[PDB]
Every structure is written in structure tokens, then in C-alpha cells.
Amino acid sequence: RDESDVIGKLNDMIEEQPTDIFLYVKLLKHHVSLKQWKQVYETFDKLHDRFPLMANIWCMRLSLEFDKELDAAVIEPVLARCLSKELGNNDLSLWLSYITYVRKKNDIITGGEEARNIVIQAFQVVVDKCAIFEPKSIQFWNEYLHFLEHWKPVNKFEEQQRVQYIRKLYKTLLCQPMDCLESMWQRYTQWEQDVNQLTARRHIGELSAQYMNARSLYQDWLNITKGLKRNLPITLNQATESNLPKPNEYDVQQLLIWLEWIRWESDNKLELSDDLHKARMTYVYMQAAQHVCFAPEIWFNMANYQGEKNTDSTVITKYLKLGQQCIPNSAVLAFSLSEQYELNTKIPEIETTILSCIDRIHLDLAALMEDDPTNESAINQLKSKLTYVYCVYMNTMKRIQGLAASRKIFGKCRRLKKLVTPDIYLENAYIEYHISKDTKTACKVLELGLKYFATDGEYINKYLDFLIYVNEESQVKSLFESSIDKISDSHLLKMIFQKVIFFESKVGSLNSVRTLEKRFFEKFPEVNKLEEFTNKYKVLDVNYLQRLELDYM
Amino acid sequence: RDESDVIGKLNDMIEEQPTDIFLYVKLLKHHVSLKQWKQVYETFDKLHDRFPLMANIWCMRLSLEFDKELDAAVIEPVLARCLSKELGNNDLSLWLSYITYVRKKNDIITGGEEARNIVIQAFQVVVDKCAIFEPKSIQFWNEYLHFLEHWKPVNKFEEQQRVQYIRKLYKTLLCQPMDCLESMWQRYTQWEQDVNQLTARRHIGELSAQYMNARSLYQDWLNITKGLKRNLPITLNQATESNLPKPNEYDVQQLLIWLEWIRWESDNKLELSDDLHKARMTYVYMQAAQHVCFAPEIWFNMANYQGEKNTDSTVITKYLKLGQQCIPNSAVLAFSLSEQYELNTKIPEIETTILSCIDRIHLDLAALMEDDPTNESAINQLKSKLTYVYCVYMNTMKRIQGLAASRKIFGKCRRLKKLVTPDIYLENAYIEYHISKDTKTACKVLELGLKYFATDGEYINKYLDFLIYVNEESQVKSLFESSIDKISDSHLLKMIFQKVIFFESKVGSLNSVRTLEKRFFEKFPEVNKLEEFTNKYKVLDVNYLQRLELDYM
Incomplete structure (x- = not known):
């Protein structure tokens, strides 16, 4: 409960959903309008720490600085x-901002020789790192050709150097799938018959084939890439609630396109070297990690791709962790990180990363239960998700630290009461039963779960399976007899009667079996007697009576 | 190896397939042509003992006698x-033969008073037991009306008695669904306005409604009964290989019609009394048991229907046993009989009836393996059937007589070598494991089965399931590692890799898990890595990662 201090409410919301970028944007517009730059930079740094590879965000900070000479400090x-070696962004909008700053800082008119070379070095690094990869790059190439073309060769060396760069620019670009291809080739052909009528024919002719290939490959990319969307805002003022993803959100259709683009590149159709193919794949992965940043599959596929190629036992962990910063409630990434930590003998990190996901889900669940309390289905899914992760967490700690640890974990779930689901109880009975094949402790855990779930057909079903599985004959019939009028909607109830009858027939009585059948034909008239008899005599889950004798069924 | 004595070869074939009626027919035509009546009667008695309720066969014996005065002895x-109280046939062709003999034995011209009454008593018993039930009965009714109509009333009593029988005949027949309805009603209306013009109107009018009902009910029967076939031969010479079913054979389409006719009657649409409804249902069941005599379902439904109604703990056994005489290799009937014997405390009968089925299957299997040795699929089904019945037999004796008995039974299957299937081994390991949750004895049974089935993906699959189920961690991986290049066609192999990986991940190593995955991605390229990761983390058979997080999968 704050008063009427916007900064306080904003940071509270940010704290609740630290992955909601628009919230930071709002807090940034606010600090910017009040000129409180220390906080503006503090706010951006919070974003960078969490979203290091979101090039669009870095573009926002730079643009904010450019709009106000250029202070190099x-x-x-x-x-x-943002262009560092470990957390290196490789995005055309950011590179275009880079080049813009290098150009403004190295005046070519007033700096001559060294100047042109520095700028040209800039363009070439954008060329080698990004432009030969991104097919929607005409603005870049155009800006670089025009720069070289606009160069007034002073002396004879500069003159020979210019024609060289220009021919290098053309041969590089006209070989890759791009949107400027058809047009860049008209300017290349006119240009070769301009620099030398003798050599035109064989220069133009030595590219020719590679250019047709590039053009057709670009067509395929166009087909694959059909509705691909790339509209992340690159400026603070251009950011809206709509062009920034909400926590955990991504358009599955967009994700499928990225994955297909990546699949089309995994093939190395351009026949590049090992290192260039890897750089091309990496560029596309990073493009995807930026546009469907909340899709766990993109981070999962990326981390494994990077770690595949070469050694460095740290690579897979690195990308999974960036992915978890984007999606902290992701069980896929928490479990993936967990495997890597265990693989690298960073045992403490295993529990810490799992608890991290668990805590984030607990925050989502409490928020969902208070914010839309009638949404029973979403509340039930979240409870299930929480329970599932506690399950894997419990099984993992039993395996890594032992029975006492898994017991403490089960205790914490037992105290969450009906916040959790039946699964944590079932999974705990199995852990208890397998210590020495004793039934006492486990059966008590399941009896205790009955206090909360006796009305849950799904719990009763699996509880019966555990009893059968542990072979506690008398209990099987007890639980059933006691659950018959408690279980929700037939389907499971029909299926359970069959489970019990089959079990009891394997363990005689016949009188038991017979009455259990009487009630069965009572609760479910219209069930074919012979068909049910046939189910009762299954061996290893195969209804042989039907298969070998009652074929027409 | 006989010489050239037909009687010897015939009896050998009969002995091999005692349910093949045409074989007896051939042996009967042969004894009849040589006039060896002692053997003819001996041959028929063999048939009657096995097929007591096949009315057509009794018709064959009677017709053979009629064709040669009429010897009552x-x-x-x-x-x-054949018309006895316990094994009573109730078929119009047999009843028509009965009436024919009563008529020939009680001359009405030369015996007057008592004669007519005996004959008329005959017709009425056919009427009460069969004709008010069988809708294809015009020949019968016609013969009875003509008999009464042809009666020359001598005195005034006979005259009044005749009009009474005739009106009783009409009121009985015109109320049931039959094929003579439309026509019998024209003769009834003309007849009432013939016996009394004053009373016609109200007699004709008191039936009227019931007659329309009967006519519409007959139409439904016609619809249900569409292609129903009833062509069993009623005479020796009319019998062919085609109008008599071959061992175990029945047209499933015919069976479905009988069951539907019976289902249409189970409703009691005619609103008959308890006793009359039961007699109507019984008549139709017996008609079915005669025409699809090798369909286990007809005997199974009949025995239970009969035993439902009232007490007499012997009724269900009675009909199941007739059914087993028709289909001795039927596991459905052997298991059904087994339950009844156990229910009635006839414990010895349990093993005897099961061994009976087992021995008959052994005879079928040996005959199939020698007679068409290339039919691998039918040989494999029969081996499976044999094994299945040994399985139920073993589980049943363990439960009823103990571990030593089930052990002897398993021993007999172990000595049949590859005549049996993997199932008997798996089912025996479970029996062994559940004595005291020890693994030693059971694991040895499965290792021994590996000597015959290591190449059977299905055995390996279930063997792995038993190991997981018993939690023998080291063996699980051993068996797998050792079965990978032995298992037939992927499908199961893919499924098994997933089974093992999941288990090993539950029981750490990660290094084990990792390499087991390496080989998995080698043997099955094109398997989605993330999808497989998601399977590895299932809890209680539910892929929660997909369900709660990777929905689009």
C-alpha cells in the first residue's frame, strides 16, 4: 500500500513480473520525463542484467542518448x-546504431586517411558478423555501397583501393540469399562494364551461377518465412503493450516459423565452412531468442546446438540460464539446468535452480488465486504444475541426498494442504515403499492423502494401482468398496471396477469377485457380460479370449 | 495306418475331430448301406451323447426308421x-415327426373316441411347447386346423367340442407374431360368420387389436431376422459337407442375427407371464444353439440366462457343459465351467475341465503343425492360445493348490520348449516374485526364457517391465544393452529405449542416461530431442512438461 508515488507502484509491479518489459519501459519514460537519469540508467541496467541478448532494448538506450553532439563517456x-565477446548482440538495428556512432565520431572530411579506414572497418565488421546472414538487409548494404561509391579517390592508390572494396562488397553480397539481390546485380553489371570493358564479361560471369543460386535460395526463405513477425520496438517511445510480449507469452505460430527457418539452415545449403555455418546458425538462433523470447523450446534448442559443436562444459549452461532469466517458471529449463549442474559436479546449484522455479510458480499461483479466483481451470493447472515440479524435485533430492531430504520436501507439500495435488502423495508412497519393500509407511501417506482427495476418481484410481502394485489384497477391496459412491463421473469408475474385479479374480474368493460383479452390473447396466468376463481373464494386459476366440469383438 | 477298411479310416477321422458331424454322417451312410444296424445305432448314440440338443440329428434317426409299417419297439x-424332461428338444421339424408317428399309431377311423383325443393332445403339446413361439410355423398350424376342420362331428357333443377347439386354435395363433397371420385371419372371419351370424361381430372384434399387434410384431421380426439361415439337414441323405458346420466353425453374421432376435425377445413385448416369457426365450436360445452351435457366446449367454431366473446351482453348469461338448477347445467355456465348479465346491472338476481344453488345443496344434506347416501365422496363434490357457491354468492352480503345483505346471511348459510362448515364462516369474518379494528365482526363470526368446522384442519389452517393476536397476540396463541388436523392427525398440532411459533417469547416473541417449539418437535420428527429454520426465505416466508447458506438442 503506497500513496500516490508512481515510482513506488511501478517498481512493485516490476517486482511481481520481472520479465514484463513494458513495465520497465513505463518506469523509464517516467524517470526520463523527470530527468532523473541516475534512475533511468539503473532501470535499464536491471533490464540488461535479465535480458542481455535483447538487442532491441540496447537500441532503446542508445537512441535515447543519440537524440541529445555525442558524449563518448x-x-x-x-x-x-552490448557488443562484448561473451554477451554479444548481433542485430542489424543495433549494428546500424553502432555504425552511426562510428561515423559521427570519425569525420571523413576533417580526418581523411585514418578516418575512412576506421569507418570502413566498422562497415566490414557488420558485414562479417551479421549482413551476410540476415536476408532482410538492403538498408545496410545500400548504405555501405553508397559510402564506397561516394568516395572521391584523391590519388592513384585510393583509386585502385576503391574499385577493390566496391568489387569485394558486390561479390560478398551477391552470393547470399537476400532482398537486394535482383537490384544489386543490375548495379554490379553496369558497374563492371564501367570500370573495364575488357574484364566485365569474365567478372560478371564468374559470379553469375552463385547469384542465381542465392536468388532461388532467397525465394525458399521467403516461402518458409511467410508471416514471420519482427516488430520489437527499438525506441522508448515506440514501445507499446502490444509490440512487447507479456510474461510467458509467445505466439506459437511465430515460434514454428523460427524453428523452420533454423531447420532450413541446419543443412548448410550454402556450403559454408564449419565456422561460418556455425556463425550463420547462431545468428538465426539469436534472432529467434529475441522474437519468441518466452518460448522455452528456442532456448533449449539453442543451448544444446551451441554445446554440441565443441567442448567447453559451460556453454549449454550459459544459454539455458539466459533462457531461465526470461522464463523463470519454466520447468523445462530448470530440469535442463539441473542436469548440466549435476553433469559438471555443481551439486548445490541443482537444488537452488529447482527451488527457483518452484518459488516463481508459487508466486504465479498466489497471484492467480487472488486476481481471478473463479478461473478454476487455470488455478487447477497451476496447482498441477506446482505439484509436478515438487514431484521431480522430491525424486531428485531422494536420489541425490537421500530419504530424510525427500521426507522434508514431502512435509512442505503436506503443509500446503489442497494447494497441491494428489501426485505428490502418490510419488511419496512409492519413494517410501521402495526403501525396503515395506508397506506401512507408504500406506499411511496415501491414507492421509485420502483426507483431502477421497472424492477424486483420479487419486482413487492410482491409489488402487499402488495397492495392486504392492499387492495389499484386503486394502484394494476396502478402498474400492469405500470409494464407489465418492467417485466423480463413471468413465474412471467403470475402468476402476474392472481393475478391482480383475485383481480379485487373480487372488480368488470368487464370492468376492461375484458380488463385486453384481454391484458392477447394477451401477452399469448395458455392459456386455461376456466382454467383461473376457477382460477379467486378461494376461499381461492382453485380452486373449477376444483376440484368439471372440474375434468379432 | 489301416489297409482298405473304410470303417477304420472313418472312425480315426471322427476320433480326431469328434465335433465334425458330417464325418459321422458318412460313417452312418456306410453302415446303413451294409445293413449293419447295430453300428448305425452305435454311431448315432455317439452323436446324441455329444450333441443332445441338435434336433436335426434326431430327425435323421427317426426319418431313417419311418422310411422302413412303424416298429414301436x-x-x-x-x-x-430326445423329448425327455432334462434334455428336451423343442424343434418344429422334430415335433412334426412326433405328430406323424402319433397319427400313424392311433388310427382315427378305426379307433374313434380315444384316438382323436390322443392325436389332438399331441397337436396341443406341439402348440404349447413350440408353435406359439416359432414364427415360421404355417405348416404346423395349417395341419392342425385342417385336422380339426376335417372332423365329422358324429353327435351333438362332438359338434360343440369341434367349434371350441377350432376357436381355441384361432385365438391362440392369431395373437402371436407369425407367417400365417394375414391368411389365418381371413379364414377366422369367414368361419365366425359361418358358425353364428349373431356372435361374429363381437368374437372377431375381441381379437382384432391383438391381431394387428401380432402382425406388426411379425414385421419387426422379419426386419431383424433378415438373412437368418436355417438349413441343417433333417435326413441322412440331405446332409452335405456344406449344410453342416465344420469343427469350430460358425458364420459370425448368422450369430449376430440370433443374438439380436434373442435381444428383441428379452424385452417381453408380448407381455406374457413370467413362465411363458422364459419358455419363449428358451425356445429361441435353443434354436440358436442349434444353428450356430460352435459359437461360444451363444452357450455362454444361454447358460447364464437359464441360471439367472431361478435357483438350482446346477443349471449354469449344465448348459456350459453342453456348449463345451460342441467346442471342447473353447477357453471361454473351460474358464466359465471352472468358475461354476469352484462356486459349487466341486474342486477336482476345476482342474479336470481346464486340462480338457488344454489337451484338445494340444491336439489342434499338433494337427495344424503337421497338416499345413507353412502357415506360420495360424501356428503362432495356436501356440499363443495354448500358452494363454496354461497361463490361466497355472495362476488358477497356484491360487487353489499352491506354489508346488504351479511349479509342476510351469515345468511341463518349460519342457514344451518353443511350442509355447514367452507369456508362460513372464507369468511364472511374477508368481515366483510374489511369494516373498525375492528376485533370485524369478530372474532365473526369465534368464532361462531368454535362451528361446532373446530375439523377441515383445519378450524383451515385458522382461524389462518386470525388472523395472521389481526394481533390479543393474539388470535393466544389462538386458537392454544386450538386446539392442537382437530386437525385431523398431517400434518396440524405440518404445523400449524410452522405457529404459526414463527408468535410469529416475535412478540417476546421468552419465548412464546420457550415453543411453547418445545411442538412442544414433539408432533413431529424426527423433525430436526436446520431446524425448519431456518423456524422460513423466510422472505417473503423464507427460506434464508437454501438457502444462509445451502445449503445441
């Missing part, structure tokens, strides 16, 4: 961070 | 047997 540290 | 004992 502020801009270079930022460029150094 | 021979005919009445036969009529007494």
Missing part, C-alpha cells in the same frame, strides 16, 4: 557491454 | 430320449 561503455 | 425309446 556515456556511449562507449554501453557499446562495449 | 424301436421308435418310442428314441422319442422318449
Whole structure:
């Protein structure tokens, strides 16, 4: 409960959903309008720490600085961070901002020789790292050709150097699948018959084939990439609630396109070297991790792809962790991280990363129960998710630290009462039963779960399976007899009667079997007697009476 | 190896397939042509003992006698047997033969008073037991009306008695669904306005409604009964290989019609009394048991229907046993009989009836393996059937007589080598494991089965399930590692890799899990990594990662 201090309410919301980028954007517009730059930079740093590879966000910080000469004391540290070697962003909009700053900082008119070379070095690094990969790159290539073309060769060396860069620019670009291809080739052909009428024919002719290939490959990309959307805002003011993903959200259709683009590249149709193919794949993965950033599959496929190639036992962990920063409630990434930590003997990290996911889910569940308390289905899914992760967590700690640890974990779930689901009880009975094949402790856990779930046909079903599985004959019939009028909707109830009857027939009585059948034909008239008799005599789950004798059934 | 004595070869074939009626027919035509009547009667008695309720066969014996005056010393004992109270046939062709003999034996011209009454008593017993039930009965009714109509009333009593029988005949027949309805009603209306013009109107009018009902009910019967076939031969010479079923054979389409006719009658649409409804149902059941005599379902439904109604703990056993005489290799009837014997404390009968089925299957299997040795699929089904019945037999004797008995039974299957199937081994390991939850004895049974089935993906699959189920961690991986190149066609192999990986992940190693995965991605490229990761983390058979997090999968 704050008063009427916007900054306080904003940070509270951010704290609740630290992955909701629009919330930071709002807090940033607010600090910017009040000119409180220390907080603006503090707010951005919070974003960068969590979303290091979201190039669009870095574009927002740089653009904010450009709009107000160019102070290098502020801009270079930022460029150094976002273009660093370990957390290196590789996005055309960010590179275009990079080039823009290099150009403004190295005046070609007033700096001559060294200047042109620095700028040209800039363009070439954008070329080698990104432009030969991104097919929607015409703005970049155009800007670089025009720069080289606009160069006034002073002396004879510069003159020879210019024609070289220009021919290097063309040969590089015209070989990859791109959107400027048809047009860049008209300018290349006119240009070769301009620099030398003798050599045109064989220069134009030495590319020719690779250019047709590039053009057809670009067509396939166009087909695959059909409705691909890339509209993340690159400026603070252009950010809206709509062009930024809400926590955990991603358009599955968009995800499928990224995965297909990546699948089309995994093939190395351009026949690049090992290192260039890897760089091309990496560029596309990073493009996807940026646009469907909340899709666990993209981070999972990326981390494994990176770690595949070469050694460095840290690589897979690195990308899974970036992914978890984006989706902290992701069980896929928590379990993946868990495997890597265990693989690298970072045992403490195993429990810590699992608890992290568990705590984030607990926050989602409490928020969902208070915010839309009537949404019974979403509340039930979340309870299930929470329970599931406690299950894997319990099984994992039993295996890694022993019975006493799994017991404490089960205790915490027992105290959450009906916040959790039946599964944690069933999974705990199995852990208890397998210590020495004793039934006492386990049966008590399941009896205790009955206090909360006796009305749950699904719990009763699996509880019966555990009893059969542990072979506690008398209990099987007891639980059933006692659950018959408690179980929700037939389907499971029909299926359970069959489970019990079959078991009791394997363990005689016949009188038991017979009455259990009487009530069965009472609760479910219209059930074919012979068909049910045939089910009762299954061996290893195969209804042989039907298969070998009552074929028409 | 006989010489050239037909009687010897014939009896050998009969002995091999005692349910093949045409074989007896051939042996009967042969004894009849050589006039060896002692053997003819011996041959028929063999048939009657096995097929007591096959009315058509009794018709064959009677017809054979009629064709040659009428010797009562021979005919009445036969009529007494087939129309007896316990094994009573109720079929129009047999009743028509009965009436024919009563008529020939009680001359109405030369015997007057008592004669007519005896004959009329005959017709009425056919009427009460069969004709008010069988809708294809016009020949019968016609013969009885014509008899009464042809009666020359001598005095005034006979005159009044005649009009009474005739009106009783009409009121009985015109109320049931039959094929003579439309026509019998034209003769009834003309007849009432013939015996009394004053009373016609109200007699004709008191039936009227019931007659329309009967006519519409007959139409439904016609619809249900569409292609129903009833062509069993009623005479020796009319019998062919085609109008008599071959061992175990029945047209499933015919069976479905009988069951539907019976289902249409189970309703009591005619609103008959308890006793009359039961007699109507019984008549139709017996008609079915005669025409699809090798359908286990007809005997099974009949025995239970009969035993339902009233007490007499012997009724269900009675009909199941007739059914087993028709289909001795039927496991459905052997198991059904087994339950009744146990229910009635006839414990010895349990094992005897099961061994009976087992021995008959052994005879079928040996005959199938020698007679068409290339039919691998039919040989494999029969081996499976044999094994299945040994399985139920073993489980039943363990339960009824103990571990030593089930052990002897398993020993007999172990000595049949590859005549049996993997199932008997798996079912025996479970019996062994559940004595005291020890693994030693059971594991040895399965290792021994590996000597015959290591190449059987289905055995390996279930063997792995038993190991997981018994939690023998090291063996699970051993068996798998050792079965990978032995298992037939993927499908099961893919499924098994997943089974093992999941188990090993529940029981750590990660290194084990990891390599087991390496080989898995080697043997099955194109398997989605994330999807497989998601399977590895299932809890209680539910892929929660997919369900709660990777929904689009």
C-alpha cells in the first residue's frame, strides 16, 4: 500500500513480473520525463542484467542518448557491454546504431586517411558478423555501397583501393540469399562494364551461377518465412503493450516459423565452412531468442546446438540460464539446468535452480488465486504444475541426498494442504515403499492423502494401482468398496471396477469377485457380460479370449 | 495306418475331430448301406451323447426308421430320449415327426373316441411347447386346423367340442407374431360368420387389436431376422459337407442375427407371464444353439440366462457343459465351467475341465503343425492360445493348490520348449516374485526364457517391465544393452529405449542416461530431442512438461 508515488507502484509491479518489459519501459519514460537519469540508467541496467541478448532494448538506450553532439563517456561503455565477446548482440538495428556512432565520431572530411579506414572497418565488421546472414538487409548494404561509391579517390592508390572494396562488397553480397539481390546485380553489371570493358564479361560471369543460386535460395526463405513477425520496438517511445510480449507469452505460430527457418539452415545449403555455418546458425538462433523470447523450446534448442559443436562444459549452461532469466517458471529449463549442474559436479546449484522455479510458480499461483479466483481451470493447472515440479524435485533430492531430504520436501507439500495435488502423495508412497519393500509407511501417506482427495476418481484410481502394485489384497477391496459412491463421473469408475474385479479374480474368493460383479452390473447396466468376463481373464494386459476366440469383438 | 477298411479310416477321422458331424454322417451312410444296424445305432448314440440338443440329428434317426409299417419297439425309446424332461428338444421339424408317428399309431377311423383325443393332445403339446413361439410355423398350424376342420362331428357333443377347439386354435395363433397371420385371419372371419351370424361381430372384434399387434410384431421380426439361415439337414441323405458346420466353425453374421432376435425377445413385448416369457426365450436360445452351435457366446449367454431366473446351482453348469461338448477347445467355456465348479465346491472338476481344453488345443496344434506347416501365422496363434490357457491354468492352480503345483505346471511348459510362448515364462516369474518379494528365482526363470526368446522384442519389452517393476536397476540396463541388436523392427525398440532411459533417469547416473541417449539418437535420428527429454520426465505416466508447458506438442 503506497500513496500516490508512481515510482513506488511501478517498481512493485516490476517486482511481481520481472520479465514484463513494458513495465520497465513505463518506469523509464517516467524517470526520463523527470530527468532523473541516475534512475533511468539503473532501470535499464536491471533490464540488461535479465535480458542481455535483447538487442532491441540496447537500441532503446542508445537512441535515447543519440537524440541529445555525442558524449563518448556515456556511449562507449554501453557499446562495449552490448557488443562484448561473451554477451554479444548481433542485430542489424543495433549494428546500424553502432555504425552511426562510428561515423559521427570519425569525420571523413576533417580526418581523411585514418578516418575512412576506421569507418570502413566498422562497415566490414557488420558485414562479417551479421549482413551476410540476415536476408532482410538492403538498408545496410545500400548504405555501405553508397559510402564506397561516394568516395572521391584523391590519388592513384585510393583509386585502385576503391574499385577493390566496391568489387569485394558486390561479390560478398551477391552470393547470399537476400532482398537486394535482383537490384544489386543490375548495379554490379553496369558497374563492371564501367570500370573495364575488357574484364566485365569474365567478372560478371564468374559470379553469375552463385547469384542465381542465392536468388532461388532467397525465394525458399521467403516461402518458409511467410508471416514471420519482427516488430520489437527499438525506441522508448515506440514501445507499446502490444509490440512487447507479456510474461510467458509467445505466439506459437511465430515460434514454428523460427524453428523452420533454423531447420532450413541446419543443412548448410550454402556450403559454408564449419565456422561460418556455425556463425550463420547462431545468428538465426539469436534472432529467434529475441522474437519468441518466452518460448522455452528456442532456448533449449539453442543451448544444446551451441554445446554440441565443441567442448567447453559451460556453454549449454550459459544459454539455458539466459533462457531461465526470461522464463523463470519454466520447468523445462530448470530440469535442463539441473542436469548440466549435476553433469559438471555443481551439486548445490541443482537444488537452488529447482527451488527457483518452484518459488516463481508459487508466486504465479498466489497471484492467480487472488486476481481471478473463479478461473478454476487455470488455478487447477497451476496447482498441477506446482505439484509436478515438487514431484521431480522430491525424486531428485531422494536420489541425490537421500530419504530424510525427500521426507522434508514431502512435509512442505503436506503443509500446503489442497494447494497441491494428489501426485505428490502418490510419488511419496512409492519413494517410501521402495526403501525396503515395506508397506506401512507408504500406506499411511496415501491414507492421509485420502483426507483431502477421497472424492477424486483420479487419486482413487492410482491409489488402487499402488495397492495392486504392492499387492495389499484386503486394502484394494476396502478402498474400492469405500470409494464407489465418492467417485466423480463413471468413465474412471467403470475402468476402476474392472481393475478391482480383475485383481480379485487373480487372488480368488470368487464370492468376492461375484458380488463385486453384481454391484458392477447394477451401477452399469448395458455392459456386455461376456466382454467383461473376457477382460477379467486378461494376461499381461492382453485380452486373449477376444483376440484368439471372440474375434468379432 | 489301416489297409482298405473304410470303417477304420472313418472312425480315426471322427476320433480326431469328434465335433465334425458330417464325418459321422458318412460313417452312418456306410453302415446303413451294409445293413449293419447295430453300428448305425452305435454311431448315432455317439452323436446324441455329444450333441443332445441338435434336433436335426434326431430327425435323421427317426426319418431313417419311418422310411422302413412303424416298429414301436424301436421308435418310442428314441422319442422318449430326445423329448425327455432334462434334455428336451423343442424343434418344429422334430415335433412334426412326433405328430406323424402319433397319427400313424392311433388310427382315427378305426379307433374313434380315444384316438382323436390322443392325436389332438399331441397337436396341443406341439402348440404349447413350440408353435406359439416359432414364427415360421404355417405348416404346423395349417395341419392342425385342417385336422380339426376335417372332423365329422358324429353327435351333438362332438359338434360343440369341434367349434371350441377350432376357436381355441384361432385365438391362440392369431395373437402371436407369425407367417400365417394375414391368411389365418381371413379364414377366422369367414368361419365366425359361418358358425353364428349373431356372435361374429363381437368374437372377431375381441381379437382384432391383438391381431394387428401380432402382425406388426411379425414385421419387426422379419426386419431383424433378415438373412437368418436355417438349413441343417433333417435326413441322412440331405446332409452335405456344406449344410453342416465344420469343427469350430460358425458364420459370425448368422450369430449376430440370433443374438439380436434373442435381444428383441428379452424385452417381453408380448407381455406374457413370467413362465411363458422364459419358455419363449428358451425356445429361441435353443434354436440358436442349434444353428450356430460352435459359437461360444451363444452357450455362454444361454447358460447364464437359464441360471439367472431361478435357483438350482446346477443349471449354469449344465448348459456350459453342453456348449463345451460342441467346442471342447473353447477357453471361454473351460474358464466359465471352472468358475461354476469352484462356486459349487466341486474342486477336482476345476482342474479336470481346464486340462480338457488344454489337451484338445494340444491336439489342434499338433494337427495344424503337421497338416499345413507353412502357415506360420495360424501356428503362432495356436501356440499363443495354448500358452494363454496354461497361463490361466497355472495362476488358477497356484491360487487353489499352491506354489508346488504351479511349479509342476510351469515345468511341463518349460519342457514344451518353443511350442509355447514367452507369456508362460513372464507369468511364472511374477508368481515366483510374489511369494516373498525375492528376485533370485524369478530372474532365473526369465534368464532361462531368454535362451528361446532373446530375439523377441515383445519378450524383451515385458522382461524389462518386470525388472523395472521389481526394481533390479543393474539388470535393466544389462538386458537392454544386450538386446539392442537382437530386437525385431523398431517400434518396440524405440518404445523400449524410452522405457529404459526414463527408468535410469529416475535412478540417476546421468552419465548412464546420457550415453543411453547418445545411442538412442544414433539408432533413431529424426527423433525430436526436446520431446524425448519431456518423456524422460513423466510422472505417473503423464507427460506434464508437454501438457502444462509445451502445449503445441
